[PDB]
Amino acid sequence: ERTSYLEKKLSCKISQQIRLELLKWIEVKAKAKKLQIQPSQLELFYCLYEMQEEDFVQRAMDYFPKIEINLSTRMDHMVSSFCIENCHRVESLSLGFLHHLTSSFCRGLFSVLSTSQSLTELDLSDNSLGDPGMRVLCETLQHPGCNIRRLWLGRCGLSHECCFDISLVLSSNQKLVELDLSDNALGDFGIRL
Amino acid sequence: ERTSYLEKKLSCKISQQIRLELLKWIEVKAKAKKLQIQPSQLELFYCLYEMQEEDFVQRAMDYFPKIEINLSTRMDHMVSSFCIENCHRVESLSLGFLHHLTSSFCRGLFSVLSTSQSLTELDLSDNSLGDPGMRVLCETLQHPGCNIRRLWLGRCGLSHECCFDISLVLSSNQKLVELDLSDNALGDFGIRL
């Protein structure tokens, strides 16, 4: 840390050894098949966000094939945003909302997905993401380079008026191959759009 | 009438004189400025529909600059349909519904308007014409040759889902110059469409 007398009284020999041990530990927890509740993926990202080191988080998070995130607070959005913005090996991604669904908040995190090349699948099912939240999602999907192929939107709070935006991304983006809208209260008008 | 012994026992001399007198009478009632309740425009069309003579109704109804019609029954739709289908001098037209709003009924009358060259104004305001009725109206408006310029749709039972059809006729027909949608319960989504 950039503090004057908090850098040069400590020893780099142990810190460098600590860095490798922490890097090794992240892989150990990431490869832990058992559902250890306390070292959750979100908790690791809290430590990873505290790194503020560009190259270290690049190699440390490269041990994340599948990402499953549940979010509760505004700070939870930025800690996750700093991770996904440089995760170049993510294949499947998901979000969990329990509360920030306004376009002034979810836009920052959703803008990350559109700029992620390795991203292929987005699982937003079983959420209360409303139409205004759905509207900003389609705005990000229209961004060129969005490599998302399959999105699951089951049990979402989507209504008929959301289908207008979804028709736009289909008419623009050619990357979507699989679309799921199961368990939505959209009528015949929604299919018409 | 094509009955055998109902043509050749009566005298054509009086009937020809009657034809001119009836033709004169229609103009007399048509030019009557006072609001004589009993010889209403609909009542005259009942007599005009009973003509079944193509050329006579052409010249007889040419004394109709403004047409104001109120309809109640299915038979009322066909008597009016037979008139408007050959009225080549109509400028302003209107309808009155009090009950046949299903597309299986109003389509026959609405198909007449699209094929009327002289027609310029359509006043459908203050009616309970719903979205399914509005949908078939936009289907007829897309027909080429529809010379309707100004339509008034105030106080109609139109909802948000009707605006999808109206956006189509605008994107296709270039004849509309004035559109009125005052007093409708369409939200921000309706304007969005």
UniProtKB/Swiss-Prot annotation, chains A, B:
- PTM comment: Phosphorylation at Ser-182 by CSNK1A1 prevents inflammasome activation by preventing NEK7 recruitment. Ubiquitinated; undergoes both 'Lys-48'- and 'Lys-63'-linked polyubiquitination. Ubiquitination does not lead to degradation, but inhibits inflammasome activation. Deubiquitination is catalyzed by BRCC3 and associated with NLRP3 activation and inflammasome assembly. This process can be induced by the activation of Toll-like receptors (by LPS), through a non-transcriptional pathway dependent on the mitochondrial production of reactive oxygen species, and by ATP. Ubiquitinated by TRIM31 via 'Lys-48'-linked ubiquitination, leading to its degradation by the proteasome.
Q: Where are the LRR repeats?
A: 118-138, 147-168, 175-193
On this chain, the residues bearing Phosphoserine are: S104, S111, S182
- Locate the motif KFERQ-like motif 3: 174-178
Q: Where is this motif: KFERQ-like motif 2?
A: 17-21
Compartments where found: Cytoplasm, Cytosol; Inflammasome; Cytoplasm, Cytoskeleton, Microtubule organizing center; Golgi apparatus membrane
Q: What induces it?
A: By activators of Toll-like receptors, such as lipoteichoic acid (LTA) (TLR2), polyinosine-polycytidylic acid (poly(I:C), a synthetic analog of dsRNA) (TLR3) and bacterial lipopolysaccharides (LPS) (TLR4), and by TNF. Up-regulated in osteoblasts after exposure to invasive, but not invasion-defective, strains of Salmonella typhimurium (at protein level). In macrophages, up-regulated by endocannabinoid anandamide/AEA.
What's the reported outcome of changing F189E? Slightly decreased ability to activate the NLRP3 inflammasome
Q: What is the effect of changing F164E?
A: Slightly decreased ability to activate the NLRP3 inflammasome
Q: Could you say which disease the record links this protein to?
A: Familial cold autoinflammatory syndrome 1: A rare autosomal dominant systemic inflammatory disease characterized by recurrent episodes of maculopapular rash associated with arthralgias, myalgias, fever and chills, swelling of the extremities, and conjunctivitis after generalized exposure to cold. Rarely, some patients may also develop late-onset renal amyloidosis.
Entry note about domains:
The pyrin domain (also called DAPIN domain or PYD) is involved in PYCARD/ASC-binding. The FISNA domain is a critical mediator of NLRP3 conformational during NLRP3 activation. It becomes ordered in its key regions during activation to stabilize the active NACHT conformation and mediate most interactions in the NLRP3 disk.
User: Its family?
Assistant: Belongs to the NLRP family.
**Name this polypeptide is given:** NACHT, LRR and PYD domains-containing protein 3
The record lists the organism as Homo sapiens (Human)
GN (gene name) = NLRP3
